[PDB]
Amino acid sequence: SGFRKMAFPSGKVEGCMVQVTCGTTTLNGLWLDDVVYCPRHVICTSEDMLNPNYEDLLIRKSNHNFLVQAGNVQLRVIGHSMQNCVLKLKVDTANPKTPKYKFVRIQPGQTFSVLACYNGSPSGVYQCAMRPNFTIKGSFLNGSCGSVGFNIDYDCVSFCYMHHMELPTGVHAGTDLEGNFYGPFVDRQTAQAAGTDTTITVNVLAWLYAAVINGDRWFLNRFTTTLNDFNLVAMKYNYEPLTQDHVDILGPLSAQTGIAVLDMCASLKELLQNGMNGRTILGSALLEDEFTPFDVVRQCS
Amino acid sequence: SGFRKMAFPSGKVEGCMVQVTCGTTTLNGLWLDDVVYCPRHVICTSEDMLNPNYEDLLIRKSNHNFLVQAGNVQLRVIGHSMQNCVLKLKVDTANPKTPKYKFVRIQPGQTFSVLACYNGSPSGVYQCAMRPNFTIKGSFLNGSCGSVGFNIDYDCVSFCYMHHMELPTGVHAGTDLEGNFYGPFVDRQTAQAAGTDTTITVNVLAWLYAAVINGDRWFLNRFTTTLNDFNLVAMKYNYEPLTQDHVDILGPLSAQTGIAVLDMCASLKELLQNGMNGRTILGSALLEDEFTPFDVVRQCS
Ligand SMILES: CN(C)CCCNC(=O)C[C@H](Cc1ccc(F)cc1)NC(=O)[C@@H](Cc1ccc(Cl)cc1Cl)NC(=O)[C@H](N)Cc1ccccc1C#N
Ligand SMILES: CN(C)CCCNC(=O)C[C@H](Cc1ccc(F)cc1)NC(=O)[C@@H](Cc1ccc(Cl)cc1Cl)NC(=O)[C@H](N)Cc1ccccc1C#N
Domain ranges of chain B: 1-14+100-197, 15-99, 198-301
Q: Which of A136, A189, A192 to mutate to test the pocket of ligand 1 (most atoms within 8 A of CB)?
A: A189
Evaluate whether A284 touches B280 at the Cβ level (below 8 Å). no
- Catalytic residue chosen out of the listed positions A16, A44, A85, A145: A145
Q: Which of B97, B155, B147 is nearest to B117 (CA)?
A: B147
> Among A53, A50, A89, which residue's Cα sits nearest to residue A69?
A89
* Angular region, B142: left φ>0, alpha ψ -120 to 50, beta rest: beta
Answer whether B12 touches A (CB < 8 Å): yes
3-state SS, residue A130:
coil
Rounded-to-integer distance, Cα B266 and Cα A120, Å: 42
Nearest to B158 by CA among B111, B110, B101, B100: B101
Top CATH class of A1-14+100-197 equals mainly beta
DSSP state of B40: G
Residue A182 DSSP one-character state: S
Give B196's contacts (C-beta < 8 A, 6+ positions apart): B133
Q: Which of B134, B272, B138 is nearest to B205 (CA)?
A: B272
Query: Which of A 186-245 lie inside 8 A of B, CB atoms?
Result: 214-215
Longest dimension (CA), chain A: 69
Chain A contacts of B128, Cβ < 8 Å? 4
Buried b (16+ CB within 10 A) or exposed e, B106-133: bebbbbbbbbbbbebebbbbbbbbbbbb
Instruction: For residue A165, give the ligand 1 atom closest to its CA.
Output: 35
Using CB atoms and an 8 Å cut-off, which of residues 123-182 of chain A contact chain B?
A: 123-128, 137-141, 166, 170-172
Would an 8 Å CB–CB cutoff place A4 in contact with chain B? yes
Spell A262-272 as b/e; 16+ CB within 10 A means b: bbbbbbbbebb
**What phi and psi values does residue B228 have, to the nearest 5 degrees?**
-75, -35
Residue A240 identity: E
Segment (H or E) for B19: strand B17-22
Residue B205 is given by DSSP the state H
Distance of CA B200 to the CA centre of its chain: 14
Residue-level length of chain A: 301
Residue A193's closest CA among A126, A134, A139?
A134
CATH number of B198-301: 1.10.1840.10
| Resolution number, Å | 2.1
Ligand of minimum distance to the alpha carbon of A1: 2
Half-sphere exposure of A167 (CA within 13 A, CB side): 19
- How far apart CA B77 and CA B62 sit, in angstroms, is 9
CB–CB of B126/B137 below 8 Å? no
Q: Which helix (H) or strand (E) holds B234?
A: helix B227-236
Pairing status of strand B121-129 against strand B148-153: unpaired
Q: Is residue A39 a contact partner of residue A164, using CB atoms and an 8 Å limit?
A: yes
Q: Are B261 and B254 in contact (CB under 8 A)?
A: yes
CA distances from A27 to A34, B62, B127, B141 (A): 18, 53, 27, 39
A145 is catalytic: yes
For the Cβ of B165 lying below 6 angstroms from any atom of ligand 2, the answer is yes
Same fold, A1-14+100-197 and A15-99: yes
Q: Is A60 exposed, middle or buried (0-12, 13-18, 19+ CB in 10 A)?
A: exposed
Give, to the nearest 10 degrees, the angle between helix B261-274 and helix B201-213: 100
Tell me the pairing of strands B73-75 and B111-118.
Answer: unpaired
* Nearest ligand 1 atom, CA A187: 29
- CA-nearest residue for atom 15, ligand 1, is A191
Q: Report CA-CA distances (Å) from B202 to A235, B110, B281, B283.
A: 40, 11, 17, 20
Count Cβ atoms within 10 A of the Cβ of residue A181 and give its class: 0-12 exposed, 13-18 middle, 19 or more buried: middle
DSSP string across A236-263: HTTBPPPPHHHHHHTHHHHHHHT--HHH
The class (CATH top level) of B15-99 is: mainly beta
3-class DSSP state of A31 = strand
Select from A10, A283, A299 the Cβ nearest to the Cβ of B9: A10
Contact B22, B66 (CB under 8 A): yes
Mutation site for A-interface testing, chosen from B13, B28, B123, B125 by largest number of A Cβ within 10 Å = B125
Residue A111's CB: how many other CB atoms inside 10 A? 23
Burial status of residue B46 (CB atoms within 10 A of its CB: 0-12, 13-18, 19 or more): exposed
Cα-Cα end-to-end distance for chain B: 9
CA–CA distance, B202 with B241 (Å, rounded to integer): 9
Contact at 8 Å (CB) between A125 and B10?
Answer: yes
Tell me B58's DSSP state.
Answer: H
Compute the distance between CA of residue B63 and CA of residue B92 in angstroms, rounded to an integer.
Answer: 12
Please give the Cα distance from A264 to A261 (Å, whole number): 5
Is the distance from CB of B207 to CB of B290 less than 8 angstroms?
no
Contact B256, B266 (CB under 8 A): no
Measure CA A99 to chain center: 20
- Distance between CA atoms of A140 and A39, rounded to whole angstroms? 15
| From B117, B145, B160, B265, active-site residue | B145
Instruction: Say which DSSP state B182 is in.
Output: S
Among residues A137, A300, A277, the alpha carbon closest in space to that of B283 is found at A137
CA distances from B116 to A294, B35, B127, B146, B164 (A): 17, 20, 11, 9, 12
User: Could you tell me which of B273, B251, B271 has the C-alpha nearest to residue B262?
Assistant: B251
Dihedrals φ, ψ of A115, to 5°?
-105, 100
Instruction: Tell me how far apart the alpha carbons of residues B64 and A206 are, in angstroms, rounded to a whole number.
Output: 46
> CB–CB of B9 and A171 under 8 A?
no
Q: What is the CA radius of gyration of chain B?
A: 22
Q: How far is CA A158 from the centre of its chain?
A: 12
Is A115 in contact with B215 (Cβ distance < 8 A)?
A: no
- Is residue A113 within 8 Å of A170, Cβ to Cβ? no
Residue from B74, B90, B5 nearest B284 by CA: B5
How was it solved? X-ray
Q: For residue B91, report the phi and psi dihedrals to the nearest 5 degrees.
A: -115, 165
Ligand 2 pocket test, pick from B165, B167, B186 with the greatest ligand atom count within 8 Å of Cβ, gives B165
Does any ligand 2 atom lie closer than 6 A to the CB of residue B137? no
